[PDB]
Design a protein around this ligand. Structure first.
Ligand SMILES: [Mg+2]
Ligand SMILES: [Mg+2]
Ligand SMILES: [Mg+2]
Ligand SMILES: [Mg+2]
Ligand SMILES: [Mg+2]
Ligand SMILES: [Mg+2]
Ligand SMILES: [Mg+2]
Ligand SMILES: [Mg+2]
Ligand SMILES: [Mg+2]
Ligand SMILES: [Mg+2]
Ligand SMILES: [Mg+2]
Ligand SMILES: [Mg+2]
Ligand SMILES: [Mg+2]
Ligand SMILES: [Mg+2]
Ligand SMILES: [Mg+2]
Ligand SMILES: [Mg+2]
Ligand SMILES: [Mg+2]
Ligand SMILES: [Mg+2]
Ligand SMILES: [Mg+2]
Ligand SMILES: [Mg+2]
Ligand SMILES: [Mg+2]
Ligand SMILES: [Mg+2]
Ligand SMILES: [Mg+2]
Ligand SMILES: [Mg+2]
Ligand SMILES: [Mg+2]
Lengths: 145, 153, 47, 102, 116, 49, 112
RNA sequence: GACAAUGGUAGGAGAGCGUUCUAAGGGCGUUGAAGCAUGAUCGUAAGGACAUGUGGAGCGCUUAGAAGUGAGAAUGCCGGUG
RNA sequence: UAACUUGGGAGUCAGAACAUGGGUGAUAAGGUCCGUGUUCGAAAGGGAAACAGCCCAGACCACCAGCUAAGGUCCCAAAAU
RNA sequence: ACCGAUAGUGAACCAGUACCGUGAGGGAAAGGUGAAAAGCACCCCGGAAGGGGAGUGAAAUAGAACCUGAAACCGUGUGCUUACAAGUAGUCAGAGCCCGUUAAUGGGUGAUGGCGUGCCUUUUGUAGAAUGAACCGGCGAGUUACGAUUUGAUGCAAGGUU
């Protein structure tokens, strides 16, 4: 009816970032990373199309948990077969496949609609190294809030 | 009631799996039976005898008090000539709807003017109220004009 | 053992889509002016 | 060039020279009607202000005081049996702004 | 004088079907079910025209607060200072300034910050 | 007075309502009876007194 | 031109010659009789009788060349159905609908 | 210009459109009537129009009467088609 | 801002949950039975994850306008890391 | 101010007939070429049925299932759109591509986001796993006579009335 800037594809730019996964305790990081992916700090936010911009997290082993939940916060998974809850991953999952530790815990922050699961693919987590996306010119953002 | 047939009860009841239908000539069949038809009746009421004259003295006073009345003297012709009356209607000019009135009878005026569209020939004791406001022009003989006040007043 | 629902005009047409017939071989004889069926012999062909 | 005016109760952005829809304002077709309530007369050098900024938004001429497209309200309550429907057409007075006075 | 329903019906149902186009499948071709779907479509239309006024001043709150903290101001401290600044502007404008033309909004954030 | 423009008396012809002819008359589906019971059935009515 | 030829009451069902008729549209009309001659369906000669009877209207009537035509459209509408009975069990009958079908092909050179 | 009031079932109270026929007045109709299909138009509702096709002969409009007057449900009735 | 007298037209006589005073029950029930209030029935919205009966509040219609109530302010999801 | 073929008699049509019953007795459906038969001579594919030309006719898109031909429903190429998706089927935002109107804040299609459990009866209460409807047409439920009491109307007035 009136005017309101409804940004579009071929009207939006997308850039990149790098976050170091230092001693922020996985919620303090993986809340603020979710607001980056939804473009929610950029002014040209129109919710019916995908705004936002990519995020690579690099070292992913300096994550901690305060309290004694290093062995609690157990995870679950059901195979659809009977008797098949697999509680075999405690919250100490960092010793093997720690990429799936935070890449779980952004896809819970994002909505699960037919655009959000597209938008969850704009995230990358790497082991401890530098990122193999040197040919993409990332920048640095490291201060999360 | 009065349609033919219907004593049968077609389905039984419980068991068959149709409606609980009763006869063959119930109203919702495509057979007969109409629940609320027109009863042959009569359409006739009446006003009191004072109101029944007050309309009629108001009908022709609608003519005289505004726009239209004419009193002619009497006129006789023995042989029935339609053309000798359509002649007369256009001398003393009237429009297509016109009402002539004889005093009690006319062997010719009742029997002429019976072909022309828009003319009624009524004896002065047969003065109803539809035609006298259906017409637009009273043309009466002078012998009945003295009588209609002597019979309505 | 009955249907619970009339199947609409989408799962009628979507179901019958693997219900077709394909053409057969149709290799022509050398001198028939007539197409025999492959690995067969006609009645009035060059076969 | 760049200003913020208001009428009805709402606020309308000007982009000087354009034509904007707005609701019924009283003087007739084809005449010269102005505004006086500018909350922000920006432009090349923005001059933000008080409840007013003491600068007249210039007179836009008036066109086409007709009525809007018909919308159809229709509500009901579900199983207890009720109905309402009634038509509704809302007036609008478009106008072409021409200049500005800061 | 018996009177039957001669075309008070089919001239009436073909302004429901014609008013109901583009519905899926068999809700645009036939009366007895497609009268229901148009009959909800008004009931939605009365409802959601009270959502455009509950959605667009939920949109503008995002794209102001995305632009307010590009100048070290959170949204909550902003409009407290803006109301003390005596600025009677909407939000829809304060959006449309802050997305087309930053240099206007670049000093508008100062005036609210300078009242505090 | 004349036939083609006759006007009735001044508050004397009121037209009678057909009952049970639509939900938007004020007499819909049940036409003034109620829901169930003795009065609502066809032909029912207690003797007076 | 566009010559056509129909047959207006054929005894078979529509859904059963909808199979073979939706297999020869848009082909060379010369060999198009031979596809119909080399199946084994129900009315594979009955369509073939009509399609021979449409080429033979493209000669005496319209003088189009019988070199090689092309079939733009072929379809079969529902015909006037016949309705019968058959008794099965416990006194109840069940209807049998012996359907009928129109048939309609068009044949043309394509060029105007 | 004010000033207040307007959720709503059973139910009570007003103002209304449309269908068939008659009475009166006034019209349109082979230079194409009623119905039928299509359309982005008009009225606050029921509804009213106007062009364009198909249609081959009888219809509207104002006033006023009389009623076999309005359809989505009755395991409704009948005829069609899945 | 109601009240009462008269005269036409009815509908209801299957209620429910909360908050409190009580009997019965076992200081058992979404139990039953009385008092007394509210809401639903006959009331749509906002909060209580969804949820007739609890918490705010009563919809004549339009608009891409502002304040506020109950509940909230890291993300899904408007607002204080 | 009675009906115009589901109405009117059951029966407009070689009706109490087909048809069902051992019997007494039940008891249907089914109207319309045109002004006139002028009812398609002849040519062609096919065994024929049908069909394309020609021809009569104002009209055969009026061909003897015959005026008008609506809906369910089964089909034909098409402009937009669909194979990482959770759905009472819409509504409100809104991109891209195609078309140009009873010229108006234009029509069709919709990648993606909010919002959301059909309808009627019955209930203290229903999306309800309570009932009812396969769908589209047509038919189908406060009527009349006679009275009694009430307001509204209109004559006349200690009188009114057949
Ligand atoms: Mg009907
Ligand atoms: Mg009511
Ligand atoms: Mg109803
Ligand atoms: Mg009762
Ligand atoms: Mg009932
Ligand atoms: Mg009861
Ligand atoms: Mg009884
Ligand atoms: Mg009300
Ligand atoms: Mg009433
Ligand atoms: Mg008629
Ligand atoms: Mg029905
Ligand atoms: Mg059954
Ligand atoms: Mg208790
Ligand atoms: Mg109590
Ligand atoms: Mg209340
Ligand atoms: Mg909720
Ligand atoms: Mg959510
Ligand atoms: Mg007929
Ligand atoms: Mg016979
Ligand atoms: Mg000729
Ligand atoms: Mg059709
Ligand atoms: Mg779910
Ligand atoms: Mg109740
Ligand atoms: Mg179910
Ligand atoms: Mg059922």
């Amino acid at each position: 009816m009136r005017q309101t800037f409804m940004a579009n594809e071929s009207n939006i730019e997308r850039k990149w970032y790098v976050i170091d996964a230092e001693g922020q305790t996985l919620g303090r990081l993986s809340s603020e990373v979710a607001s980056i992916l939804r473009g929610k700090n950029k002014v040209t936010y129109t919710p019916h199309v995908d705004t936002g911009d990519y995020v690579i997290v690099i070292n992913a082993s300096k994550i901690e948990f305060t309290g004694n939940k290093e062995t609690d916060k157990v995870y679950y998974r059901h195979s659809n077969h009977p008797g098949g809850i697999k509680s075999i991953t405690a919250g100490e999952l960092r010793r093997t496949n720690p990429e799936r530790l935070i890449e779980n815990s952004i896809k819970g922050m994002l909505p699960s609609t037919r655009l959000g699961e597209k938008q969850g693919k704009k995230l990358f987590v790497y082991g401890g190294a530098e990122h193999p996306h040197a040919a993409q010119q990332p920048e640095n953002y490291e201060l999360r809030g | 009631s009065a349609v033919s047939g219907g004593g049968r009860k077609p389905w039984k009841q419980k068991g068959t799996g149709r409606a609980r239908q009763g006869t063959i000539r119930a109203p919702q069949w495509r057979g007969g039976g109409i629940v609320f038809g027109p009863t042959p009746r009569s359409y006739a009421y009446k006003m009191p005898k004072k109101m029944r004259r007050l309309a009629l003295r108001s009908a022709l006073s609608f003519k005289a008090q505004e726009n239209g009345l004419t009193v002619v003297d009497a006129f006789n012709f023995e042989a029935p000539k339609t053309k000798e009356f359509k002649n007369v209607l256009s001398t003393l000019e009237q429009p297509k709807k016109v009402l002539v009135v004889t005093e009690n009878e006319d062997v010719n005026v009742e029997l002429s003017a019976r072909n022309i569209p828009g003319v009624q020939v009524t004896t002065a004791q047969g003065l109803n109220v539809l035609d006298i406001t259906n017409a637009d022009s009273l043309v009466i003989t002078e012998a009945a004009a003295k009588k209609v006040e002597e019979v309505l007043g | 053992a009955v249907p619970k629902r009339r199947t609409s005009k989408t799962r009628k047409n979507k179901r019958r889509t693997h219900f077709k017939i394909s053409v057969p071989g149709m290799t022509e004889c050398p001198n028939c002016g007539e197409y025999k069926l492959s690995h067969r012999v006609c009645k009035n062909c060059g076969s | 060039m760049f200003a913020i005016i208001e009428t009805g109760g709402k606020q309308i952005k000007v982009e000087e020279g354009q034509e904007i829809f707005v609701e019924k304002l009283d003087v007739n077709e084809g005449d010269t009607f102005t505004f006086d309530k500018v909350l922000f007369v920006g432009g090349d050098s923005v001059k933000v202000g008080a409840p007013t900024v003491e600068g007249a938004t210039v007179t836009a001429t008036v066109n086409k005081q007709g009525r809007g497209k018909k919308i159809t309200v229709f509500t009901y309550k579900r199983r207890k049996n009720s109905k309402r429907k009634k038509g509704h057409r809302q007036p609008y007075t478009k106008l072409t702004i021409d200049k500005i006075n800061a | 004088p018996r009177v039957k329903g001669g075309t008070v019906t089919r001239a009436r149902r073909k302004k429901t079907i014609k008013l109901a186009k583009g519905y899926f499948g068999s809700k645009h071709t036939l009366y007895k079910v497609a009268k229901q779907q148009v009959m909800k479509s008004g009931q939605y239309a009365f409802r959601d025209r009270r959502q455009r006024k509950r959605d667009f001043r939920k949109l503008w709150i995002t794209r102001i607060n995305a632009a307010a903290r590009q100048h070290e101001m959170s949204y909550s401290r902003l409009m407290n200072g803006l109301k003390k600044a005596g600025i009677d502007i909407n939000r829809k404008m304060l959006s449309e300034i802050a997305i087309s033309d930053e240099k206007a909004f670049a000093q508008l954030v100062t005036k609210a910050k300078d009242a505090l | 007075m004349k036939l083609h423009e006759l006007k009735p008396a001044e508050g004397s012809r009121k037209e009678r309502n057909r009952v049970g002819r639509g939900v938007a008359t004020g007499n819909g589906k049940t036409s003034g009876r109620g829901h169930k019971g003795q009065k609502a059935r066809s032909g029912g009515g207690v003797r007076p007194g | 031109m566009e010559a056509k030829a129909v047959a207006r009451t054929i005894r078979i069902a529509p859904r059963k010659v909808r199979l073979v008729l939706d297999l020869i549209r848009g082909k060379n009309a010369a060999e198009a009789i031979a596809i119909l001659k080399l199946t084994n369906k129900a009315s594979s000669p009955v369509i073939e009788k009509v399609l021979m009877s449409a080429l033979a209207n493209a000669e005496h009537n319209y003088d189009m060349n019988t070199d090689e035509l092309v079939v733009k459209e072929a379809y079969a509408n529902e015909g006037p159905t016949l309705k019968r009975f058959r008794p099965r069990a416990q006194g109840r009958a069940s209807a049998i609908n012996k359907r009928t079908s129109h048939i309609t092909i068009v044949v043309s050179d394509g060029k105007e």
